[PDB]
């Protein structure tokens, strides 16, 4: 079992070797002053002695205290007008409004041809190798067969094949968790937050929640915030998948009823086939979530994946897989079995040191409080 | 119409990116001679002279070196006399080897001294780096070339341009060779009165005291052989097999050894029937296959090595695309264009373009003055 679902693949038929990615290309509101008669719909700039500026839109036509020659007095009158609803604040949202007006209003046909906002680019990839050995005793192999009719080395080989596939999935996750930007940061901070960590015991992070029930839902809400930031930065859309620790997955599986599948048929039949190398399911109808079997502490990462082979932000491009390796160790001539694979990986360039903490397709958050 | 890379490895691409291989090589207390030492024939002693450090001296004569010479100056004097007499002979690295083998051989053991083939053998990744040209021509000529000469116009321009792009890529290869080539007439290939990297025909040292051009030209060849040797030594693959050189240098080389180059006498007799000057001139001394750098910028030659294996060149070019056409016109004046694009990728034996500049052991470049 593999999990190369949340990466592009673009498989290789030669190392070195390349992948492609659809990389994106990447106004003086008049000052408000004493005596100013604001005009409804107009916007003024006002710097408060404490906290600095906001842009204030008039809803009410009003003269802002002509006697307010003292900035402290002017701030007081303005605050009164704000309280009265006469003056309303927005910051960048108004900067956008004025920019649009100025450019449209005084615009011209000229030749403002813009490129579509996409660079579209590629990287070179080596089909980096990975390999494991079985390293096993003769007596064991003799006994597995002699004692229960087992296939001995064949089974050890199957375990080993599973392990190498797991390591590759683990590698992909490690790179995601390397390159992902740290989430619950910047655009995704709650003002009272701890920047990068979601603490299920912290009243800000849990939005005033009570017990695990509501605290758990609050995490999913942070996940949506991460998905939004991803969408914005990549220019491609909301995060489509989540990679998370077992603690987190169990938390997320406590919500969205049966979405994270327990493989309940498995439990019912007493562990008939555990297949623990797959995605649990889709949270919110939005995020396919995968379990990081090797999570080191406790965390989750939200990421985006489009339909295009070139729209993942991370690529895995297999060249060689499960090539059997066999022989013996002459020191005692004990059996050797093993598997080799070669694939190569890559990322949206985002300019590995240009991906470290920079990969716009992903946002990583540390988890505390479960 | 020729690649002029018949002296290099190709390993052509089936996709850009794209790769090449190269057969990169992997890369004793002589007892001090002292006053009273009774030497024994064939034995080797270490001696530090007051002047110019040390020498290693082998006895040819079983002689005591002045037991009263407690003064290093006296010891040196006796030694010099014994050397003049032929009793003591100086060799340096040539001795280090004999002591090492005697000691190591005699005291060796079956153990596990399995030595490696002296080769690393490795690969490089190459993008199908592109180059391109346009005809940049006018319609009024196309109209009259047809009306006046009965010429196919664009067709000839296409042939010219195709020729130019091929010549330009061949030029690029030569530039990379020269870029990466080590400086010749340097280190192992210098004489005491030498100038480090340049052969000057007006310099008595470079021409080894030659009488007129005949001997001077041969002196250039002698420097070429020395370069071929240093290449052989450093690559571990053998003497340089070819030469790339400027028009002046080639004409000089072709002035000795009678028939190294083709004079293209058929061509000349027929009054330039088809010059095709994109081909190797011939073989210098029967040893080095030599090509003319028709674009040489200073005046020079480069000696280089190439084995039969494409992985044994020191430089690689993997043609992916060649002569892909361009066609259109520029509305600013509506004048037409025709053109070509190529894609290929190049490589250099790793030698660890950062590890290529002035480091490529397969090649040695020497500038030539005074021709």
Swiss-Prot record, chain B:
Q: Which UniProt keywords apply?
A: Capsid protein, Late protein, T=13 icosahedral capsid protein, Virion
Asked if the Swiss-Prot or TrEMBL record annotates the protein with the keyword Isomerase, the reply is no
Cellular component per GO? T=13 icosahedral viral capsid; viral capsid
Modification comment:
A proteolytic cleavage by the prohead core protein protease gives rise to the mature major capsid protein during virus maturation.
Keyword Disulfide bond found? no
Q: Which family does it belong to?
A: Belongs to the Tevenvirinae major capsid protein family.
Q: Specify the protein name.
A: Major capsid protein
Q: Could you tell me which species this protein originates from?
A: Enterobacteria phage T4
Upper lineage is:
Viruses, Duplodnaviria, Heunggongvirae, Uroviricota, Caudoviricetes
The gene for this chain is: gp23
> What part of the entire protein does this chain span?
105 to 521 of 521
């Amino acid at each position: 079992l593999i999990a190369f679902d949340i990466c592009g693949v673009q498989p290789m038929n030669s190392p070195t070797g390349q992948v492609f990615a659809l990389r994106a290309v990447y106004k003086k509101f008049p000052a408000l002053a004493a005596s100013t008669q604001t005009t409804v719909g107009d916007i003024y700039t006002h710097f408060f002695q404490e906290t600095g500026t906001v842009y204030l839109q008039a809803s009410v036509q009003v003269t802002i205290d002509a006697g307010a020659t003292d900035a402290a007095k002017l701030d007081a009158e303005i605050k009164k007008q704000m309280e009265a609803g006469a003056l309303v604040e927005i910051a960048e949202g108004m900067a956008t409004s004025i920019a649009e007006l100025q450019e449209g209003f005084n615009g011209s046909t000229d030749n403002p041809w813009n490129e579509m906002g996409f660079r579209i680019d590629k990287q070179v990839i080596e089909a980096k190798s990975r390999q494991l050995k079985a390293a096993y005793s003769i007596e064991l192999a003799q006994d597995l067969r002699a004692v229960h009719g087992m296939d001995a080395d064949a089974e050890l080989s199957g375990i080993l094949a599973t392990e190498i596939m797991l390591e590759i999935n683990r590698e992909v996750v490690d790179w995601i968790n390397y390159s992902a930007q740290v989430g619950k940061s910047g655009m995704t901070l709650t003002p009272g937050s701890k920047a990068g960590v979601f603490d299920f015991q912290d009243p800000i992070d849990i939005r005033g929640a009570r017990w695990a029930g509501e605290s758990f839902k609050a995490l999913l809400f942070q996940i949506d915030k991460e998905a939004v930031e991803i969408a914005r930065q990549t220019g491609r859309g909301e995060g489509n998948f989540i990679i998370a620790s077992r603690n987190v997955v169990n938390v997320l599986a406590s919500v969205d009823t049966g979405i994270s599948y327990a493989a309940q048929g498995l439990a019912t039949g007493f562990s008939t086939d555990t297949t623990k190398s797959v995605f649990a399911g889709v949270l919110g109808g939005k995020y396919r979530v995968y379990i990081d079997q090797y999570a080191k502490q406790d965390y989750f990462t939200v990421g985006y994946k489009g339909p295009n082979e070139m729209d993942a932000g991370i690529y895995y491009a297999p060249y060689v897989a499960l090539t059997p390796l066999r022989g013996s160790d002459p020191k005692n001539f004990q059996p050797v079995m093993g598997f080799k694979t070669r694939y190569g990986i890559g990322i949206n360039p985002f300019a590995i040191l240009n991906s470290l903490g920079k990969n716009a397709y992903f946002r990583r958050v540390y988890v505390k409080g479960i």
